[model samples]
Target chain A: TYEGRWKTVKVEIEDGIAFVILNRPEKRNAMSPTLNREMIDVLETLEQDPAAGVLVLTGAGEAWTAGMDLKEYFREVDAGPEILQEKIRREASQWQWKLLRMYAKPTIAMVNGWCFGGGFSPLVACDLAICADEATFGLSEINWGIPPGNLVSKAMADTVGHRQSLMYIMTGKTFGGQKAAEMGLVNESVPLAQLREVTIELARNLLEKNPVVLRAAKHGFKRCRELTWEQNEDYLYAKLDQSRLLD
Target chain B: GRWKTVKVEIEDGIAFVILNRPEKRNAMSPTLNREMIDVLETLEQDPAAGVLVLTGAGEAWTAGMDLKEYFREVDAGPEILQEKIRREASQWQWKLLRMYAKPTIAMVNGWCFGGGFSPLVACDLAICADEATFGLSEINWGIPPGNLVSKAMADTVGHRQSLYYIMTGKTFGGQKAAEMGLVNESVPLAQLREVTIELARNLLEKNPVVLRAAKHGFKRCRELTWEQNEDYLYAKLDQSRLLD
Candidate 1:
């Protein structure tokens, strides 16, 4: 509605939830810098919109993203440090990665198709992922020479442990819905036709919870893993008191 | 005192597999290699040996291949080189590292280099003291570390770092090793024994039936293509008595 233009992403709302669809049908929604930046902007928009209580991300036509814009990566590689630095400074993919990790609201990644490289990061960053029957996921980085950065490595390891993570990252193999679910990467797998409905249902469950309570629960869960128990307890108690003051 | 060459001790359900021979800095030689192979056999046979903690008796875990042995075989024919490598470098060590369902830990007390470097590539997990050092120094001696070492090193450290070390034969410490994903954890030399034992104990507490299945499942399945991995996993599951 803001742009009044049909484009790479289609933004919609229903029952106080934001649905951001990656609309690149031909490219299978490959996450170019432009698309990445646009998505980040949309996320910010969702944050400010009081009507939007939860966010669901998915592709419009087909496929999540084929990881990085490898063509862009290689182009930068070929162009040397000048272009590389500019890309780093401007590339939305990097920022999208940061946003996925730091987003406060409960986010669900409704994976529809091929999720690779940067594709999987967004899913991992979300609170839960419901991959479609047609979905395939992999970090196709190692085969291309770059090691999986901190986000990919830690996420994979946390889900499947060191051994399976190592093998997957090393071989750069692709896995689909059933195996991905078995490995605990995705919470559930539904038919491609039911994907939107499934995700809406998931967000609705969270939407009904008190917003403050949901936010606090998310923060508490993150703290438990990221901080020592001593530090986490102190922070949680302080945050609770602050919430009471606001109330 | 009598068995100072390679000390043997058991702690917390793990058989501490030490390489003593510090006078030679635990160099891999015919005598030591044979003895170590025999030790592996004994551990394989022992019902009590739940896991193995591979370490060195003194400062150096192993300075790599015994250079004296290397020089002796330098002038020999290809077949001699093969045989010497066969005894000095047994696939049993490699299998122990990769195939042994029981967890193996490399207690990197000090220097871990050369052929010593390759064997650890097979272990399920590795723990190193902060002061401990590691390198793949074989290329310096005019030969590659072979396919097994190359793949294992790449599996742990990634291509960029693994290639740098394999090509350079330069020494790196535990922190750097862990950062490169070569080692699981790095502890102070003082905590090496305690920390490593705790890790082994964690593994030991898992349901053995489930653990064995999980171990074999990953090892067998991951190496194959997606379709093949699925087929292989089902076949393994069908054969698993633990499921019953």
Candidate 2:
């Protein structure tokens, strides 16, 4: 449904699954400030599209994303006017966590190749993930003498184990999709040739569920992650009416 | 606090609430459920109890609710009686334990089965002995796992895995339980008490004010929208900061 040629993203809606590819394959899809701003618009546009039932975020080529464009994030943004730097930071970060994490439909990350550093956040913000067995991943901020910045630490911590997350950050190690699944980073990993097919099959499962109830069910689990049962009791019971949903 | 089905002992700031029905493998009966409520309420205000460690006195943590007492007894009572006890069961197992003032850790020493999964999960954290057994046997009785058991395990253990165990009425041990994310860790039986105590003490030494505030902050934020959470969490952080 998206007809315009985006500078750093692409979209295709087929059989209710919207494939939103991070499109800077030449840069290994490393997000630039422009890409960040464009992503906000793309998500907005796709959410309203009638054809999109579930969303699949992926990369165009050799990498899911090398995270942020280091040169632009540091030198270019740093050298700019102070106000501009703030603008870039706000624009760059607002979409990844705030928008994506709260996106209306179910989202899946199809990590076809390399996923590293800043890439970890969006990889996690998705509702689920599937990756090729050959896909690579890493968190190397520690090697640069810095903590994993922005929401990366929280993102990874939310997905993986407590000590395992710290170990990877401490050692700045790279791992494969198999390890990612073992670490509970992705839902599962499959052969590279079968990655797309597996992701599509999973997307279809969500498509088969009740549309209104599916969103409610997803939010039921997600929102309640932080809610006490006293608080959750009323909220959870409100989601059901009297259905087999045979009614 | 004196109770017949439960025992409470506070040592070095860790309050151990032991399930005391060894003859029944500590099955949770209506009387035990009521006692737990009193025990938790007493400790909430008792300054001596810094952390709540719920464990068992004998061989089993709990083989879950006493089937005869929980079901058959209800059948023998007035319909209103069934309603009353079911409400009491949820109060201790889910609502009260979840919102308790102090940190709670399930010291799963042995059997933790069926409806028992609710209390272990309702706690803030859990550790189990490697030899401990866990199962969902509601399916074995020709009933689906209900009464928040499914919800309690749904988010902790991924659906694919929880489904396999729940549907088959199968059993898994502490090691698989940890691997499936049911408990935080699986330690050797001899080390279970020591490890749980060490973790509790680690929690005890932190600023209880911030520990309470920060955990509540983490729990309440996920339900909030972006803008709502922004104002809510930061304002919460600011409040916790200004307090001490």
Candidate 3:
């Protein structure tokens, strides 16, 4: 039932799980302005399309995503003229995390291959992640002239321990999926042969939970992350009541 | 100056704040409660101490709340005095060490139980000896965990694990604690002090002002959305750099 000129995006839905594929394997799915636009459209569509109960974001072909397209995107930024670049980044940034993280339904990142730089922004933002042990992840910004920027550092600071966050950022090293799990970046890393099955298995379990309760529970925990003990007590008490009515 | 229930020693920019009640297993009595506030206030401004290493004197980090005395007082203590003591109790460990300007570490040496979860979670980081015992025995005592402890557990350890431990009143060691994400690591008893010292030194090298800002910012931004965070962190970074 789904057909369109998605360009850099493709979606296939079956049995309540919507698999959103980053469809630009030729360039390792590096995000250009068009890809970013398509992503926003895809997220907005699937967010409401009742058929989709859970979303699994993964890449096609060899790589997950090489992050922002260094050539196409950077060249535009230089031609940015600055305001245009800022505009591109704003839209790009929003879809990468700002929207996906707070999307109506749950989101899971399935990291099968290369996940680097900008890829981490989404990885860290996803509600949960399942990575293949053979998958590669990097914060290679330091290898170039920059440290992790904006939300990448913010997400890392928020989710991971300070020691490892800075260690990787300082060294600009690449790590495998298992190490990512150890560092708290992903929920778990399974063998490549089992990645698809494990991720779907987890998603199936999630799909069975009461949607309202699950949403309230996960969102409440996210909010509590920034709250004080007293504040958490107040918010959680109120949240429990609110969910009572919703459910 | 002599202290009855606590001791403070500073060396190499490290403040060794000991919960000294070895004979009592470092349990918190009314006297220890008052002394803890004093020690925390003194170290906050003490120039010689760049980082604080919190531990107990003997085998137990703290048996927690001096159970024998707690029951005795709860049954017979006067209300007015109990209220004041409770005030001081929550005052000292609740957020006193958490929001302290200096980096703090909890070196869990032996027994950590019940109310002990408060300060252990409050510290910036925690490491324990593999032999150290930890428990949420409040359920067995016929009560739920204290409000503060419940919140602390949620912050550090997720609901699944916290629920299991909180309800069962079972005991675990440091290795289990680390696996549950309650502590940073579990090391051999012989290496506990050295491991804590090594971590303390890593913190000691950082610019105190920047360190304070970075840590405080991290704690605050954990729940905020991007729109809320961008403005706060951007400004905080500029302010930290200005002081540098």
Candidate 4:
């Protein structure tokens, strides 16, 4: 226990569900490259395991990734902006979108508190989100002298209207559970005590369905967005062929 | 006057229409709707009724459309449905609230819901009581709110906020309405009468032609794209000066 040699992530599996807790509570779960690499490694392990039917992600403490480490951000900023930006984009793609997207099982974010900037991106990337009543959320990149990351802007616009999205995202405004629910930015809001129970119930509902069908359906849903009508017909036909052949 | 259920008065160039049926919490029935439409239509001809102020006489504003008529007409034919649709339509009220030559205000004292929300949207502006409650309870009864009311909500609150209000049928109050950009302003119930009259008089003393053009031009802007709106504003300014 005292080794402290390897930076770590906490992952637990119980009853065919994997719970990944972002475990840097002391740092308020500020995203670090170490955490990113560890998360990607854990995701790869989950992908190889077939028994896991769902993944529940949450921060270890009161704050969800309060964004990238600012001190580390500026330290890298001085190291040349292009290199830093590339590093961020690469890290985000590999650890967040790519890894999560590849997982066949559904993912749910149990957002407990303060989800902002880079911190909130991973949660939105998941299929569903259950937020605590007292949770505060924002895309506060404007205060940092930069435009919002492309991910936040697109997600915010899809959830709220263009005018309101632009107003809040551009001005770095903070909002709470009711406003978030009203804005359609989050799927649901509930009491903090019930967050885990509600999320698990939802995950169990998914587990009860046919895993093969659910996996194919989830994959097809994302693939359809990138395919045209004619292409989609062929794509879906090919999907059916693969599923039948595999069976 | 043949009507005893509603009271109409004129003072300081403002036409005040009070919903006098307090025993029923100002529930809007067929008679009340007819009376309301009559009062608004009369203002079109009355030089003395330069601005209009609508309020309830008791603790509640109009508590949505009268449901008794719906229950009575449940087994009735299509003629009743058509009649109900025509009467509840907001087109005439929109014409009144737009009040091109003068401003209109709703000094809401208490609960305002469903059809009650329509008249306030018609007004050029609103000053509501702090305790005033608002709802679009139509969805609860399996009916869609009329178009202009939905559009007004979208214009005031953003699309997402409007969707939340419409979907949940939640009751929100004046303070939240002001914060959410639905109401222009809110004040204590005791201060509503004085505040509304003062605001109305302030506008009444301004150049009538200027007020007319301002209202028309502002509405014209919202109905067009930003480029068209700017061009229309410039043209209207020139046109209003020509009237001078």
Candidate 5:
């Protein structure tokens, strides 16, 4: 069903796992506007596809994604305020990290290579991430005279905690996947050869759990962090009843 | 003022609030909790206090709740049990420590168990002596870790580690706890206080208002989605600018 409509991403379905690859390998799979728009479409299709129980996001070639396409995604759109704002609103709200964060099926970021700057949005949005041990991750925005924006700062702070996040952000230094895992950015890391194997193994384990319960569990975990102890208790008690009714 | 269950000393803008029931292994009783809350309140209003260091008077930080006083005596009646819990443990832990006005640090000197995990995790930072012991012994006592201890454990350490410890009721030392993400770091028992004081001093260098904002932001924004967090943070930044 998802064929020529998407130019920047390719998908392959195998044994209930949908492998979503970011195309444009010549540009190191940089996220152009077309890619972001097409990704939302692919994600929506896979969310309903009964054959796909889990989605794994990675890149087409050596680099996962070098982040936003500086040419077409930024400078080209810098012509008019209305155009820039519209593009941002569409990409930021409709697709990209927002859609992935609340996707029906579980999502995993298979970081086979570089993950930097704007790329961290999806990396942190995925419920779990497994990176190739040699892959590099960095927030280079500060190096270019700008702070990491678009909620990247908040995501990094939330995932890796404050001390590590502040150090990396200030230094604008690159780190390997192993260090990323240690800092709690990703769940784990393995050799490039074993990256797919480890991620698929995790996906299979997730497949064994009831999908309905998994969704509720993710929502509950997220909600509880925002609530007071008494507030969370009350919400959870009601959530248990709601889950039972849904079941 | 003198207190029977706790002691407070102020030095160089850091308040050392010690759990003083060392003879009873610093096990938390109704009296100790009440005294602790009072001391915390006093420290909160103290102009000289910039940071709070919570540790124990003797070798043991706390050996969980006092079984005889908190469980047996309070368990006499349902009404009394609820009232005592509200007055002693719940209010201080949830209201005071979790959302303390100034920065707080847990200086885990020795034994920290069950209910002790609540305050340890509540603190923004925790530094433990390498020889210090920590456990969730509630499972062994035929009950799950209650009073937000379970939540604190799960929040500080991930669910995998929390489950293993809570299920087995196993005790671990400071180094192991640090590795498991329970405390921030561990130092030799001899250097524990010095290292913690250094950390407190480092915190004192930052703008106090921003530090409070940063702590609240980190704790609250974790639960929000990226968009919600983004909007909230933007407003917070704007608020900070307005205050400036």
Candidate 6:
């Protein structure tokens, strides 16, 4: 049932888990408009498929994503104000990370390799992340004489605290998976050989929980952090009632 | 300069505010709360006070609320109890310590239990004696920790650790508390004051205006969405530049 031009993405479903791979390894999976467009389509289809209990996103080759393709996604696409405005609107609203953050199914980011710049948006967006210990992460916009654009700055600040996020963004220094985990970027890191196995185990564990409760728990954790103590208390009370009704 | 249940000592721009009720392990009462509010108000405006170190008079930092004074006396009537709760909130705890303008450090020398945790969490930083004890022992007394104690504990330590202690009502040592993120650090009883003073001195070197702004910014930004936080922080940065 999953047949299409799907030029920039690949999907493999096994049992109840879907492994969605970013397929443009030739350019190190850098996000082009086509990739962004196809990713949202794939996610939409999978969201409706009853067989997909969990989703894991990674890349086909040595890089998860080398951020956006400066040529295809930026320079070439900047034809005029109207074209640029529409493109920006499409990319901003239909970005894969924004969908993954609130997706119906649980999501995990299995960072097999190079995760840099805009790549952090999806990495932080995933409910949980497990990276290969050798995987590389960077905020290299500073090296290019520009600030991290398109909410990369905000994503980094949200994932890590302000002090660490500021240091990495200003210096454009790259770090390994262990350092990223220590700085609160990802959930944990494992050896490259064990990365897939560990991620599968985590996904299986998550699959064991009641799906409705699982969804509520994920949304509750994210929303509660931005609430006051009293507000959270009331919100949780209402959430409990809602969960009961759903059951 | 004399106070019944609290003492204020200032040196080198550091104010050491002691809860002086060691005879009852510095348990908080109506009188102590009032005196604490008064003392904190004075220190808030004192030019010599660059930082405030809060501690207890003797072996205990505080055993939390005085059972007899805060409970028995107030529980004598519903009207008195309601009035007492209103007064307590008006002058102390969250209203006073959490919103205090100056940086406050909780120096936990000994016991910190139940209601004492609210103020401890309110402090900007905390250091405790390794021998000091901490607990949310209200569960053992047949009631949950009330008066925002649950909220304070949850904010300081995450939900798992907070729930563990809250449900069990067990006592833990200062080192364990530090490990659980309740206190920033722990040291020997003899060095508690010395370590806290060193930290206060480090803070004193920072520009007061910027420090205050940073504190307010951090608190406010925690409750904002990513976009809202970005907008608010940019505005704050512009305001700071203007101040400079």
Give me the candidate number with maximum TM-score.
Answer: 3
The Cα RMSD of model 3 versus the native structure comes to: 7.2
Residue B120 in candidate 3 has what lDDT?
Answer: 85
Which model, 5 or 6, shows the larger lDDT? 5
Tens-place lDDT per residue, model 4, B8-31, is 888868888788889888877666
Reference-based TM-score of each model: 0.53, 0.58, 0.66, 0.50, 0.63, 0.59
Here, model 4's chain A TM-score works out at: 0.87
Summarize candidate 4's per-residue lDDT along A4-96 as a digit string, tens digits. Answer: 323646777778778878877888787776677788877877766776778888888897667666666556657866667556556655666
**Tens digit of per-residue lDDT, candidate 5, span A1-247:** 6555589999988788899999889998887777878888888888889999888999988898888786775665677575674665457545656777767788899999988877887887788899999999997754554445456666786688543554455446799989999999999999999999999999999889777777777767766766899998999877777778886
Range of the 10 consecutive residues with the lowest summed lDDT in candidate 5 chain B: B235-244
Chain B structural similarity (TM-score) per candidate: 0.87, 0.94, 0.93, 0.86, 0.94, 0.93
Which 10-residue window of candidate 1 chain B scores lowest in summed lDDT? Answer: B222-231
Model 2 spans > 4 angstroms off? A1-96, A99-158, A161-182, A185-247, B71-76, B220-228, B242-244
**TM-score preference between candidates 1 and 4, better one:** 1
lDDT of 1 by residue, B1-244 (tens): 3243456687657888888888888987656666676677777777787878888878998887787865566556576666666654665457555766566777889898877866676766787889998888788879888536776775566667878998898989988977777777788999998998876776665544444444455555434532343345435533543453
Q: Write the per-residue lDDT of candidate 2 for residues A97-190, one digit (tens) a residue.
A: 7777767788999999999877887887888999999999997654443445445655665677543554465346799999999998999999
**Candidate 6: residue pairs that collide:** none
TM-scores of chain A in all candidate models: 0.88, 0.92, 0.95, 0.87, 0.94, 0.94
RMSD of each: 18.2, 9.9, 7.2, 13.6, 7.9, 8.4
Question: What is the iRMSD of the candidate numbered 6?
Answer: 7.8
Worst window of 10 by summed lDDT in candidate 5 chain A: A162-171
Off by over 4 Å in 3: A1-93, A102-119, A126-176, A182-184, A187-247, B67-78, B142-144, B222-239
**What is the lDDT for B103 in model 6?**
74
Fraction of real interface contacts that model 6 preserves: 0.03
Docking quality tier of candidate 3?
A: incorrect
Better of 3 and 4 by TM-score: 3
What C-alpha lDDT, on a 0 to 100 scale, does residue A93 get in candidate 4? 53
Cα error, candidate 1, residue B198 (Å): 0.5
Task: Rank candidates, TM-score, best first.
Answer: 3, 5, 6, 2, 1, 4
What's the true lDDT of residue B76 in model 5? 73
**Whose DockQ is greatest here?**
5
